[PDB]
């Protein structure tokens, strides 16, 4: 249907050029939660899923678009974060655009990014 940025979450946290400008990726919403906890979502690059915290315009758009699992987005403004004392990975997303609503799930059984880096402690930035 639409092509996701396969494996890009791995790139963001292993390549410093990508870490420093983690934008333009096309990802699929993997899960959402039913007050600021609403803005934490799960996204999928087709291979990995990871947590994303929507802020600012992205949090506004989450409300105005009724963003849900299956939606495909393109991240426009973002920065990575690693909570190193909990080994948690997050993409802080300040703006995105909607690519396709309610697309068929690309990979229903992806690898949680944080689990992959728990087994790859030397590759992670």
């Amino acid at each position: 249907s639409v092509q996701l940025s396969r494996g890009d979450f791995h790139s963001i946290f292993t390549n410093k050029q990508r870490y420093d400008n983690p934008t333009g990726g096309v990802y699929q919403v993997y899960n959402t939660r039913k007050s600021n906890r609403k803005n934490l979502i799960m996204i999928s690059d087709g291979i990995y899923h990871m947590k994303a915290l929507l802020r600012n315009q992205a949090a506004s758009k989450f409300q105005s678009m009724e963003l849900q699992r299956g939606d495909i987005i393109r991240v426009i403004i973002a920065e990575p974060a690693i909570v190193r004392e909990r080994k948690k990975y997050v993409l802080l997303v300040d703006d995105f655009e909607l690519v396709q609503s309610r697309a068929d799930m690309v990979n229903q059984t992806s690898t949680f990014l944080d689990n992959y880096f728990s087994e790859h402690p030397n590759e992670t930035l």
Binding site: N36, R37, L40, V83, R86, K88, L92
Partner: peptide, 15 residues
């Protein structure tokens, strides 16, 4: 939709 990621929200969010 629970409290397991309160860490992410507390530490992050603010830039």
């Amino acid at each position: 939709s629970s409290d397991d990621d309160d860490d992410i929200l507390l530490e992050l969010g603010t830039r």
